Structure 1
Amino acid sequence: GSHMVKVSKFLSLVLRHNPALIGLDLDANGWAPVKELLAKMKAKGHGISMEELKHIVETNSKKRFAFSENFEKIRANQGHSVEVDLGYEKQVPPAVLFHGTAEKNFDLILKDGIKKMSRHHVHLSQDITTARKVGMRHGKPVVLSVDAKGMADGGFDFYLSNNGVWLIDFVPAEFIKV
């Protein structure tokens, strides 16, 4: 018994999708009690102890798991893995999204579009006032709002980070409406 690699696969299924296999109990913070996890999945035919599951979470190295102080609670960080999982929850996606930017880099951003200037980068403005507010950072602002039509039709699903900001994978400026 004790298939370490299978416990990890099974883990990512149980605490991250469907805890009901082993009877895992999920927190509001998206954590699961390890103590439950190894105990309940032990009964599920895994035969691992706390540190053996700690060994699974020790193989978290692909940035898909994490453990606590006593190691008594784990979170599998992953899901809507844009990066990993720090603020990419599939929430209510707006089709039309505003984005404040500034005028000299307006020429730049309307020429190139709000795109990869970092890995998975395009956070647009959730409100017109914030849009214009952030544009003022370089000097003169311009609001660049992508037309819902182009993006909804384009099959883009959007996601939001913790600040309630509207993210898209990439907005070519042709979809952007100045």
Structure 2
Amino acid sequence: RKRVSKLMAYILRHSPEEFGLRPDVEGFVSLNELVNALKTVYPEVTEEFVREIVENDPKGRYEIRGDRIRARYGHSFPVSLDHEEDTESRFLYHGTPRRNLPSILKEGLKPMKRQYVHVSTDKIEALETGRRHGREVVLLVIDAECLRKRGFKIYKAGKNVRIVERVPPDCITLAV
């Protein structure tokens, strides 16, 4: 389950054309074609097995609309997402290795290779995300009203994941 969901993230977010799949402007690909692509590496994968990963994913990583499937965030190619805006959250969190602090405190959170900067409404998931890149990880606290007043709307892309264009430095209130 974890292995296929990882390769599903690589296909839907980064290199769908590597498997001969062309996503539409919303990032959607046909579920039938992705199953055949997943079968190129793991032949035992079925459409039901794919619907299990989407239905049970603890982050709401994937979305199925009719006969199409997409990753809801994490893209490195630009897509057109229709997620609802988050006007509720007061604070948002981002985990990052300690080495990135001088540049983040100066330039703010940039999207890097992804289309959007990714933050979370949860401290654990934010810190867990940052641990993917290093050992000494710090928790960044982001004033969500600071972002809105500066014209950077936050969108509800996952259960707790939130995407935003970028985070200016003075919207980071605390590093722990």
TM-score (norm 1): 0.48
Indicate the structure with greater strand content.
2
Choose between structure 1 and 2 for higher RCO, CA contacts under 8 A separated by at least 6 residues.
2
TM-score (norm 2): 0.49
Q: Looking at CA atoms only, which structure, 1 or 2, has the larger radius of gyration?
A: 1
